[PDB]
Amino acid sequence: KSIISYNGNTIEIPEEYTKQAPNRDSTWAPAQASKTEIYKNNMVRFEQKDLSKQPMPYAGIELIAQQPVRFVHGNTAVCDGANHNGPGAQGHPKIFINVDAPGSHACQYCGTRYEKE
Amino acid sequence: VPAHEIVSGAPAELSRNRVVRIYQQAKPATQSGEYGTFAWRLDWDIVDVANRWENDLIGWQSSGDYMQATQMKFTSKESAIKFANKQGWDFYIQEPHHRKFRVKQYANNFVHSYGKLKHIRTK
Amino acid sequence: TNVETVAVAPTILRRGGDWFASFGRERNSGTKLFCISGNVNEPCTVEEEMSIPLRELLEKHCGGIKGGWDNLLGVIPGGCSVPILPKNICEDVLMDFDALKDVQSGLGTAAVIVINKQQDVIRAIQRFAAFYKHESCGQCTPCREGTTWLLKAMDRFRTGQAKEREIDMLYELTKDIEGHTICALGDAAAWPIQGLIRNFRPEMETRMKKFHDEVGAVSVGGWMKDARVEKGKVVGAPLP
Amino acid sequence: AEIELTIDGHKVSIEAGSALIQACEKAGVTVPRYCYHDKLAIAGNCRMCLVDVERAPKPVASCAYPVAPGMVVRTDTERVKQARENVMEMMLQNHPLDCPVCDQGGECDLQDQSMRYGRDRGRFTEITGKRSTEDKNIGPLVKTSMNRCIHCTRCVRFANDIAGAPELGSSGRGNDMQIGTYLEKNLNTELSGNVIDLCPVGALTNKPYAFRARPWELKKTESIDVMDAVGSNIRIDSKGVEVMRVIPRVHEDVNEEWINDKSRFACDGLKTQRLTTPLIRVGDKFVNATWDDALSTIAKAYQQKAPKGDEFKAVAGALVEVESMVALKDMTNALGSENTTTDTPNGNSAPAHGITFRSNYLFNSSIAGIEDADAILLVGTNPRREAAVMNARIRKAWLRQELEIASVGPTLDATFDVAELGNTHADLEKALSGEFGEVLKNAKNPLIIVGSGITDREDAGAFFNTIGKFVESTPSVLNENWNGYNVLQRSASRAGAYDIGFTPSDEASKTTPKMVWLLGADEVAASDIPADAFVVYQGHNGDVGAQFADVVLPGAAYTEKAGTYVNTEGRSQISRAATGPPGGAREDWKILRAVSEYLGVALPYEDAYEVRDRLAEISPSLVRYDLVEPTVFGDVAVQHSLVGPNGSVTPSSAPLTETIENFYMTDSISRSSPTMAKSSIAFNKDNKKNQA
Numbered sequence A: 001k002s003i004i005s006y007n008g009n010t011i012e013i014p015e016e017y018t019k020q021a022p023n024r025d026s027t028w029a030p031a032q033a034s035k036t037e038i039y040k041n042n043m044v045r046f047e048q049k050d051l052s053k054q055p056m057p058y059a060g061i062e063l064i065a066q067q068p069v070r071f072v073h074g075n076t077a078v079c080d081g082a083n084h085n086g087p088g089a090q091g092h093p094k095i096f097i098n099v100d101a102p103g104s105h106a107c108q109y110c111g112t113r114y115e116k117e
Numbered sequence B: 001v002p003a004h005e006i007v008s009g010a011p012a013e014l015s016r017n018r019v020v021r022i023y024q025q026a027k028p029a030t031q032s033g034e035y036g037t038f039a040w041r042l043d044w045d046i047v048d049v050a051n052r053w054e055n056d057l058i059g060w061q062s063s064g065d066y067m068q069a070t071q072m073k074f075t076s077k078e079s080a081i082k083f084a085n086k087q088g089w090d091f092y093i094q095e096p097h098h099r100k101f102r103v104k105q106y107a108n109n110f111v112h113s114y115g116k117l118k119h120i121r122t123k
Numbered sequence C: 001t002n003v004e005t006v007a008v009a010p011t012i013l014r015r016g017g018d019w020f021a022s023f024g025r026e027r028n029s030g031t032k033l034f035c036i037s038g039n040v041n042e043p044c045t046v047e048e049e050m051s052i053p054l055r056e057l058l059e060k061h062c063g064g065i066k067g068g069w070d071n072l073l074g075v076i077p078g079g080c081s082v083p084i085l086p087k088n089i090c091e092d093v094l095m096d097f098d099a100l101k102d103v104q105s106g107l108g109t110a111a112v113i114v115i116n117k118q119q120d121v122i123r124a125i126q127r128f129a130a131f132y133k134h135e136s137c138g139q140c141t142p143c144r145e146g147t148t149w150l151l152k153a154m155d156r157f158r159t160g161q162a163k164e165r166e167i168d169m170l171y172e173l174t175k176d177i178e179g180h181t182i183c184a185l186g187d188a189a190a191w192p193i194q195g196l197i198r199n200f201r202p203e204m205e206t207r208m209k210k211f212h213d214e215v216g217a218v219s220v221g222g223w224m225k226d227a228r229v230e231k232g233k234v235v236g237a238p239l240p
Numbered sequence D: 001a002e003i004e005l006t007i008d009g010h011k012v013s014i015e016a017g018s019a020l021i022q023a024c025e026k027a028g029v030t031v032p033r034y035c036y037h038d039k040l041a042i043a044g045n046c047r048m049c050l051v052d053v054e055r056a057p058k059p060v061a062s063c064a065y066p067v068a069p070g071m072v073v074r075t076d077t078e079r080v081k082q083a084r085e086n087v088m089e090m091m092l093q094n095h096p097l098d099c100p101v102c103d104q105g106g107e108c109d110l111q112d113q114s115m116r117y118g119r120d121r122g123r124f125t126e127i128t129g130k131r132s133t134e135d136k137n138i139g140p141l142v143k144t145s146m147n148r149c150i151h152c153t154r155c156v157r158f159a160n161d162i163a164g165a166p167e168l169g170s171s172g173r174g175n176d177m178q179i180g181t182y183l184e185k186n187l188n189t190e191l192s193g194n195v196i197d198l199c200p201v202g203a204l205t206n207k208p209y210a211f212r213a214r215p216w217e218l219k220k221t222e223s224i225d226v227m228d229a230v231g232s233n234i235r236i237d238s239k240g241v242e243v244m245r246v247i248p249r250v251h252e253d254v255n256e257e258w259i260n261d262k263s264r265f266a267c268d269g270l271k272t273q274r275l276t277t278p279l280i281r282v283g284d285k286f287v288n289a290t291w292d293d294a295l296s297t298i299a300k301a302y303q304q305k306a307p308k309g310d311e312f313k314a315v316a317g318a319l320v321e322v323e324s325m326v327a328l329k330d331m332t333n334a335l336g337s338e339n340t341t342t343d344t345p346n347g348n349s350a351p352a353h354g355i356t357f358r359s360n361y362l363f364n365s366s367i368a369g370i371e372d373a374d375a376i377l378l379v380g381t382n383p384r385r386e387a388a389v390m391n392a393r394i395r396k397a398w399l400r401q402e403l404e405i406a407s408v409g410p411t412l413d414a415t416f417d418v419a420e421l422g423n424t425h426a427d428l429e430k431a432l433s434g435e436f437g438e439v440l441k442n443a444k445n446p447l448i449i450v451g452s453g454i455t456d457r458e459d460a461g462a463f464f465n466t467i468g469k470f471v472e473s474t475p476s477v478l479n480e481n482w483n484g485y486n487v488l489q490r491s492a493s494r495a496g497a498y499d500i501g502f503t504p505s506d507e508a509s510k511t512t513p514k515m516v517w518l519l520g521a522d523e524v525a526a527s528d529i530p531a532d533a534f535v536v537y538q539g540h541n542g543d544v545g546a547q548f549a550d551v552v553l554p555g556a557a558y559t560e561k562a563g564t565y566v567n568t569e570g571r572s573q574i575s576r577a578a579t580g581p582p583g584g585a586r587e588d589w590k591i592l593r594a595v596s597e598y599l600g601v602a603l604p605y606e607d608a609y610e611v612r613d614r615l616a617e618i619s620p621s622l623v624r625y626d627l628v629e630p631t632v633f634g635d636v637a638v639q640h641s642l643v644g645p646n647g648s649v650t651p652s653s654a655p656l657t658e659t660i661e662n663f664y665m666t667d668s669i670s671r672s673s674p675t676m677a678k679s680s681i682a683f684n685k686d687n688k689k690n691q692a
Ligand SMILES: Cc1cc2nc3c(=O)[nH]c(=O)nc-3n(C[C@H](O)[C@H](O)[C@H](O)COP(=O)(O)O)c2cc1C
Pocket: C001, C002, C003, C005, C183, C184, C185, C188
């Protein structure tokens, strides 16, 4: 709500616009620059402007955690990232993930976690 | 030595305020190639206030120093010195550093130790 | 030194060099223990002369071949690390170093592994390539990275999931390992593949045409047109 | 003594018994390779440097085939080009498609040699495909992604040979060989961040600079490393306001391609807790302020306290420039008070050895000279911690030769093998008389290293008395052609501070100061500065030392300024400035030059060249950059450092303590970084680090 704009003056924005996204409250990087710091830094030009028609596009760190974990019988779990309705080469380059340690290992391109069983 | 700084069109402030450096580029510790380590680079030492600063707007690296991107390549050290004092510039020159030649044998790896072994090779 | 060439040393110092030098040919001298195994009638171990015919070796001291001389598909003199001699060559070949180097092969340890005509050569050399993949120490990169590729290609050629050109390819990937290694295990793992391609090309083409008309056609690497990578593993192809 | 052969028609002469790849490097012929390195042992793993040699049936490996006379070598044979394409294709068929996510994008040795020598296309297209290697957590400093390993043994050869940490190895046969600790054991050594410049592929890579930047973007700058005794050479990569990494450029004398852990990963603390504006204390609270406000507060507090003489203390610190010490010493001596001390405990007096005769406080044999040594002994030091590159030198020379070591001080865990002598000055003198008078008198090229931790001891002059009497009495340790008394200096400033004369007098150690100046000077305690005193802290980031101050003044750190630095050997070397000081920080000598104008002092210089002229007025071996001179005064200096503490100091029986408590957090930058902060806890004695 009320954040201090370098002068003791409180500025007041709605609580739905201090979130990084409507998926996630907090920041997902050590230099993500949380929204309260952003409105603190340049509120001179959020004047007379609608906050709702700003983009705010669904942070992806939370849309990948809710995907299920794939289970592989073998040793190596191989990955495309491709669709198979699409006529062509889409998705990421094929990488092969070792699933031996306890836990579920993620794809470094797509983040889909694979687990050996 | 002829003095060409008044006929190149360069300002006076570049020739009187800026010190420059001739250097041979070091061999990179990351990769084992040596191809960029032959030509003598000419490059300007930075200005304290004028180098770079973060934009208020986005975070763009904005500069006031304009020679920061220019960098020259020369064939020899003498050609770089001749050109640098021909254009009227104050230079510092940095001497290169090569590796010392030490004779290597593969058969060094397993020579007979009469006393304590004091090492275990592994290969 | 080998344990046999040391165990021969006292008697050859007693009997003399002139007695040992009489056996065999001019450069290949003396006698040798032969281990005759595989699919013969009676597997045995004898000690006989060098430079002797293979037919008189297999016929006179190990029963015969299980099924006769008609029933000879191939023979491997020496260990695993020797190319196969085919049927018409191995009739008049001698068991020294010269007459096998002349037929681009090795005497090796003079193990005689004959291969039955009702057995498959491709399954055999797939098993040899799996042996060299298991037994390589894994130090130098062409040997270690090579016999894994040779196994991945020989499993595929035993199933038959290939194009007609990929065995010319397999010849080239024998040649690239063959002489760039530390020891002679890369040299050893090259040779049986090379002997297979030199002597039994239509035997591989027959299996590949068999796979081409049992099920659908196949692209490079064994991929079929149904084959797609789903979650985790690959489906659509029967995974050799 | 030399052998002449032919490569590519070129005729070349090289010393006998060398490798063939050294003959190819001498003749200018470029030979590609993956498991050869100048500072490492020879292995024939990667099979890349095959080469056509007349009188050889097969292509022989050029790294391990020794040089013989009458040799005709060809590298442009069609067979050699075929061999390189073959071996390159073999390397690439289990190496994963990670080039957009690999950290070595424009830096990969495997990648630049695959254009130049490898095949165009790839035939690897099996359904079964590549192998996959489990990730192996080694430590907090090294990110480890071992799918993209090529098994070049180079990390293993190094941590075996030079680092002295035998925890790395290779466990397995076939493709199931791995390169890591077998048990998932954490790897310590004092230089573990050097294996990540060594791996040619990106399997061992940097953890704080994990995915931050990218080598075609980086601007490289050749500077000098502070927070090290030896003052190693670095390479600063900058995006332009930030500093990304330092990475060692080669110099065979000062560091020999290998650089400290603490020097490398302290770029994190360069940018995390900095001072960007002056702050004036109101009382229990700082406020930040104007420049005129801070500097006029300094002038008004000088006019209020009025220290007429011997009451303006000006103590410098661990990392400072020589030119800032010129500024500070000139300001205090034109003020009228040489209360001009250094930071260490027992820094208030003359440091028990001469500012006179530079060979008193310097490493007098060359750093290149330790390779020539026969039997050397150290007192009061741990060269594994302080100057960790000197430990690599000692272990390397001990491994190649017949070298004999003992130690006097705390029981140190060296990489190499020491003998123990004791924990007492009596144990020292007993060991000098009993066994090692004979050893050091017998030996050709011995030397003696003295830690500067015992210089900071109050019983210092007893040790210097005993060692000066021994070096003067023994003609082998000190003769014409080389010198054998040696000392180490912990900080990069102390050798420059002793060159310039930055030391107090005997009168200045008696009084209590009314106004104290901290230039750097972080390791001051609360009791060292008086409570009535008006202290001011000039320095680049906030610390212990900034918390005591009434005024703080931001300065440029070693990246942001061009500076002269003097090491233990005595080399003067310049750091080039990579970036500028952020916010409002200024250079360190300009601040003192401007504070002088508000006092009664006009310093005679005002530009950067006049600082160089004043610096040549102090001593002209500080405008003579990266040269080492001998000393004709080696005989006189040992006597003149013998006469002083003869009988003046009695040797007390206090045991010799360790100089630094931890390795990782010892100055103003390393204590601010979170990398050293989570490093010192993870490189504390745990089950993951116990050898067991
Ligand atoms: C992978 C490899 C495996 C080998 N195995 C044997 C063996 O099992 N028995 C043997 O006598 N020689 C073996 N050799 C050959 C040895 O190198 C042999 O001791 C040497 O080359 C010749 O010994 P010799 O003079 O007694 O014939 C092998 C060679 C290689 C490259």
